[PDB]
Design a protein around this ligand. Sequence first.
Ligand SMILES: *[C@@H]1O[C@H](CO[C@@H]2O[C@@H](C)[C@@H](O)[C@@H](O)[C@@H]2O)[C@@H](O[C@@H]2O[C@H](CO)[C@@H](O[C@@H]3O[C@H](CO)[C@@H](O)[C@H](O)[C@@H]3O)[C@H](O)[C@H]2NC(C)=O)[C@H](O)[C@H]1NC(C)=O
Ligand SMILES: *[C@@H]1O[C@H](CO)[C@@H](O[C@@H]2O[C@H](CO)[C@@H](O)[C@H](O)[C@H]2NC(C)=O)[C@H](O)[C@H]1NC(C)=O
Lengths: 20, 180, 182
Amino acid sequence: ERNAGSGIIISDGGGGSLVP
Amino acid sequence: GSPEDFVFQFKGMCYFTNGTERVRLVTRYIYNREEYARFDSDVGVYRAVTPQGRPDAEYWNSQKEVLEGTRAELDTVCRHNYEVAFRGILQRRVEPTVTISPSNLLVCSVTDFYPGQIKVRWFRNDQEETAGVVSTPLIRNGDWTFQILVMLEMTPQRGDVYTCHVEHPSLQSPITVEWR
Amino acid sequence: DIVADHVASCGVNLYQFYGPSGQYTHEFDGDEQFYVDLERKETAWRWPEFSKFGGFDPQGALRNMAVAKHNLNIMIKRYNSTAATNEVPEVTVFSKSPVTLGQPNTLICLVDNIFPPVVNITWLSNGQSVTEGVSETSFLSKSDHSFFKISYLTFLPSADEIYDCKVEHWGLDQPLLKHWEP
Ligand SMILES: *[C@@H]1O[C@H](CO[C@@H]2O[C@@H](C)[C@@H](O)[C@@H](O)[C@@H]2O)[C@@H](O[C@@H]2O[C@H](CO)[C@@H](O[C@@H]3O[C@H](CO)[C@@H](O)[C@H](O)[C@@H]3O)[C@H](O)[C@H]2NC(C)=O)[C@H](O)[C@H]1NC(C)=O
Ligand SMILES: *[C@@H]1O[C@H](CO)[C@@H](O[C@@H]2O[C@H](CO)[C@@H](O)[C@H](O)[C@H]2NC(C)=O)[C@H](O)[C@H]1NC(C)=O
């Protein structure tokens, strides 16, 4: 009786970053 | 100059063709306006669309539970919602209003109709006019109705009768409005 | 674009760092079926007719927003912290129905090609702000991942009674006043 929504999958994380 | 923004979009997109003869789910993962990863039920696994999606595609495809759940959403989301909502919405009908106004040019404004499938014909006396007819695109009002304007270039003789003729799935037979 | 008879988004999930803020809607053939008020944590209908086509458990939207916040942090890092481009929106104003003086009508302000999804849309009547009779859609999705948004002003057509839709957006150099007259 309810509409269902697609679920967002949890990204792989823990990557480094670079400052622009 | 302006404040900085960083946007994430996730789109769970359901495509239907021939009723439910063909159903396809495409889940899209977007950074700002760039789709970087996606799941396509016709493919059955995640794919990187840009290099930045490669960590997720590899990670997600290694988790059996993730693949099983996403694959099941073709049923639990798309087919399910088609049964709960979209069949009914597809039965929805809102009749168009048809008005003619002059401008030589005649403008037939067809307004406040749903769904978007519609055909507008112009007639001069007992002949359908094809040359000199030009239409706007279908205009989406955002409130679950459309409108459209269809113009006829005319060189009217007195006694000529012009007819705007509108077919639409809400109508048992076409609406006709006359301008003398 | 994928070829199909009908297309639904179940749903459109937006989350952005400015705010931060989010949006959760379902779309069918390009119109908004329902949304989730994330502040009140409840499913709602801008167009209440469509409540007849089933409800929605708002906890699904809230879970997705938590996951989206996480994912956005990660994607900001993966993209060297590249900020959204401010696109230039286009504004169109038109009546919903043929205009007859003294017959209630609705003005439609369409703001298209919105990105990022941050916008001020207001109405002016003879140069003064109008607040009564104004409503608007969600940010409705587009296949190029920009958005449009539509604002509505119920009004009574009259002579010498003119309107502007005033749009503020970071991709404009100054606020845009799009005019309309009966
Ligand atoms: C994330 O950031 C890195 C680093 O980019 C560097 O820092 C930025 C803030 C800018 O100032 C950049 O101009 C600067 O290079 C990006 O990686 C870099 O990518 C470029 C292009 O692929 C690499 O240069 C190439 O090197 C090959 C081999 O020598 C040449 O043949 C090519 O012609 C080209 O010059 C560069 O080596 C690389 N640097 C590092 C440290 O990895 C990265 O692309 C970026 N990611 C995103 C999504 O923007
Ligand atoms: C949407 O409207 C708000 C309200 O006017 C804008 O925020 C204002 O921004 C100015 C300039 O930075 C400040 O002086 C005001 O104090 C702000 N007002 C509030 C209530 O915060 C906002 O910038 C608008 N959005 C866009 C994209 O123009």
